[PDB]
A paper describes a structure:
Expression of either construct in Escherichia coli (E. coli) produces assembled shell architectures, while expressing of mini-shell 3 (CsoS1A and CsoS2 without CsoS4A) does not yield any assembly. These results indicate that CsoS1A and CsoS4A together are sufficient to form shell assemblies. CryoEM analysis further establishes an icosahedral architecture for the shell assemblies and reveals that mini-shell 1 assemblies contain mainly small shells (~21 nm, T = 3; see definition of T number is described in Methods), whereas mini-shell 2 products contain mostly large shells (~35 nm, T = 9). The RMSDs of the basic assembly units (a.k.a. capsomeres), CsoS1A hexamer and CsoS4A pentamer, in three icosahedral symmetries range 0.180-0.231 Å and 0.240-0.251 Å (calculated from the pairwise comparison of Cα), respectively. Intriguingly, only T = 9 shells generated from mini-shell 2 contain extra densities not accounted for by CsoS1A and CsoS4A at the inner surface of the shell, which are absent in T = 4 and T = 3 shells. The angles between capsomeres in interfaces 1 and 2 vary slightly among three shells, from 30° to 35° and 30° to 43°, respectively, leading to small curvature changes in the shell assembly, thus the size differences.
Carboxysomes are anabolic BMCs for autotrophic CO2 fixation found in all cyanobacteria and many proteobacteria. The carboxysome is composed of a polyhedral shell that encapsulates the key CO2-fixation enzyme, ribulose-1,5-bisphosphate carboxylase/oxygenase (Rubisco), and carbonic anhydrase (CA), which dehydrates HCO3− to CO2, the substrate for Rubisco carboxylation. In α-carboxysomes, the disordered linker protein CsoS2 plays an essential role in carboxysome assembly and Rubisco encapsulation. In this work, we synthetically engineer α-carboxysome shells using minimal shell components derived from a chemoautotroph Halothiobacillus (H.) neapolitanus, a model system in the fundamental studies and synthetic engineering, and determine high-resolution cryoEM structures of the shells of variable constituents.
Author numbering:
A (entry chain F), D (entry chain C), E (entry chain F), G (entry chain C), H (entry chain C), I (entry chain F), ...: 6 to 97
B (entry chain A), C (entry chain A), F (entry chain A): 1 to 81
Write the structure that this text describes.
């Protein structure tokens, strides 16, 4: 799929928990964890629109209560071709 | 309470708003058994041996006493086969 | 929670007033399985693979905690066969 | 996709903006723009359930703030065959 | 150009005044006046993004004070290909 | 209420906090029957013939009306075989 | 186009959404996403003055409501040649 | 063991003390110490579910009182395979 | 297993009840009951970390309400080699 | 019978009276009188579940009013085999 | 090392936890656990002055919160030869 | 020696002053200065338990009054073998 | 000279001004400008004790009024050899 879901957290433990929740909620691929700086970590998943929607909702619900908590949780079903140049393909 | 194995995830986009954002998992007692859908209150991967609860306990195990759940996963068994 | 397929609609004119105006659907796990009647809280056509809830959750899934329902359809599965 | 997304506005400018937001948000096809009368304009999109969900959410959020406003925003995952006789197949 | 600017007015006199203002403000082509119903009239212009922006702003400023007044004034610089099927090409 | 025999204990470390510290036991009606997990509200050893309760009664039998239990052991039968 | 559009957010999710809104709004190219430090992320777009204006307006309006929020949104119609040495030419 | 224990602190001294408490409490292996940014440091341990539970409890109780404090303390009994690509396998 | 769980009670009846609860809760071995003096009785069990944790929690819950009651209930998943010289191997 | 009845008192006179009441009430055998320390004395009886129930009830009701009082009165219908290693088989 | 570290608790569970904390904290050897009477249990460690200092500090801080509590925590850098006749050399 | 002492400071000047104080207070080896991120600097010293204790106390006393000040000052006399994999051997 | 002068500021402009004041005040050599993180910048000067004293005084007095301000200003007449391994020898 080409839908994009991202979750912003303050700290890495909530980010890992959120990514775990999205990956266990639906058939999405974790394509990157990004250390934004200042304590922000962003986990990005790709998949079908319904799968990404469910994964992002489950991740937000799970990681709302851990660590400094959720900062943002967004779903982009249709990603512009320009935005794909700033989106990671695989994590590291 | 019974012991089922997680098979795969289930996504229902047009589901009632009372279900919240809780994930749904397809579970069976064993491969080949009748399939069932349970609310994932723990977070588990396919192939896990999990502990399930039903009746009215599955409602409050899923988060609220008014939650529309009749089957919820309430734990992962440390050692099962 | 189980996965049933909608077969057809059911109309009961002389039914108790506690059921309100909610539609009734005949559902089964698969063709040939025992038939059951569920409250349609989503709105689905015959042949749909739907998600059903029972017990006391089916009451509040149908609209109210006092609703006379023991089986309610709470979602349509996006991909099932 | 056989899901149906509907947005109703008072005025054609909010309806055009809502249709633009729908089509830019998810992979849905605009199948009809209907003038209901009294200023009511209804735009219809078709696609998968997740795509229609995302498109309707984005269209409502966008058109809430333009023109006389948003009137209705509804999603039907499976449309009855009888109702398909009153749904346009292509816009004009 | 492919930018789109629309102005919604209650009544036809403010619509004609607004269309006149946009057409005299920049190099845009009036591609359609639509009677939405209930007294709503929508005038649509096409052109470059800057020209359409200037034309729409001038039309809104001019027609704010005439008749029942402006209802909506929107600019869509990038129009989706699906929305182009509900946009008139020439007026009548 | 049914009569099951305790087979063995069950430990689920990552279980929801609503279960408290109550022990979990694997029970069946007889050896070879389908296995089930019950909350041990009495305290019994494997091989015991015990009395079990389900539905919403198993919740308050386990300690609280909000307890996530659908099967609780509520007594040991003095004489059974 | 040689105009420059800039949006700064605290967190990567609002920056990604702002870039998506920019690229979907007007004919601008996303030339860079920069991690400034402390959580600050800056997305840059290039294009014509009208296109950059529309893109920046849409991106600000979209990203005002996602993540920790919008920090800055600026348009430079003509960029000095000295400042072009600190501007990225392609994202990564 | 495949369970994951996570503790996040502001500062490296509380993270080192938490890792020491984890390793001294139960039979868990320290697989990573991550500098998140903004002062956030995350230590990860792997082992059995009971061992990880005991280690995380002891580490949180120990690091609650040293440095700027404890931020997060989470246990994941079973980690999804996708999330294993963002988890370090050995510290440095 | 080498995990250690102990329960301190004031009196012997709560100690026997607690030991019964731990032994019926999980697969642990009762390795000693100690009369500390002054009415204190300590029951010690050994096993795996999860089994010992569950047994100790169940024993505390059971014996909280009998006799003078619980005094302490502690779990040591990783026992130091020096402490093993003061821990009984078998009861009497 | 394998059921266990336990009564704990502060002082030996209430324990002797409780044991007398137990043995006179039902068909239970007195298997042990234990000096716990600090004045605590525990008497243990074995028999059938009903016999142990009746004996413990009568012993508690009798010893509530003699000496420093009754501390604990507990019945275990089935005793775990591990706990049988800390239970005396005959008094002394 | 000839320094002596002492911790006294009411109950054996806090004493065991204090001994565990002592042995896990510094390079001290547990030479004795003594039942004083009335519930008092004393654990003794030997080592260098700095090691005994660290061990006693950690043991007190750990056992302050378990069981009936901590009674005494003392360090003797150099023990008189007469007092060495009342100090155990190995635990039992 | 294998004892570990660490001092956390907000800023580098207090960190340098603290490291100077510890190195001039006792025979310890400065094994690493770490920029945690967000302004946190950690200085780590190794040596004997008494030397490390004295060095850490002196460093805390010296650097309490300079810059943003002390954040944490901890001594670990017995370092677990797992924690040694995240501890630097030499500074840079 | 082997004396060390240190000034810490939030921001690079106050650090540059402080370094300029240091070098213009006394005969000290600027040996390093360090980015600590979180906005903290530390400038180091070396020279004789009197020269470093004068330079640090002048630099603090100058940089108190520029940028986000002065954080720390410390003088070390004699630096320990261990601390010389974490001090830069030349700026970059």
């Amino acid at each position: 799929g080409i839908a994009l879901g991202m979750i912003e957290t303050r700290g890495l433990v909530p980010a890992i928990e959120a990514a775990d929740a999205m990956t266990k909620a639906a058939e999405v691929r974790l394509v990157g964890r990004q250390f934004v700086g200042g304590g922000y970590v962003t986990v990005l998943v790709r998949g079908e629109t319904g799968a990404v929607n469910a994964a992002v909702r489950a991740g937000a619900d799970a990681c709302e209560r851990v660590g400094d908590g959720l900062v943002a949780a967004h779903i982009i079903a249709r990603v512009h071709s320009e935005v794909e140049n700033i989106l990671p393909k695989a994590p590291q | 309470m019974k012991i089922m194995q997680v098979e795969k995830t289930l996504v229902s986009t047009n589901r009632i708003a009372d279900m919240g954002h809780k994930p749904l998992l397809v579970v069976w007692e064993k491969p080949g058994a009748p399939r069932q859908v349970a609310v994932d209150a723990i977070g588990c991967i396919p192939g896990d041996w999990v502990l399930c609860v039903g009746s009215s306990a599955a409602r409050e195990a899923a988060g609220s006493k008014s939650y529309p759940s009749d089957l919820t996963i309430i734990g992962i068994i440390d050692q099962w086969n």
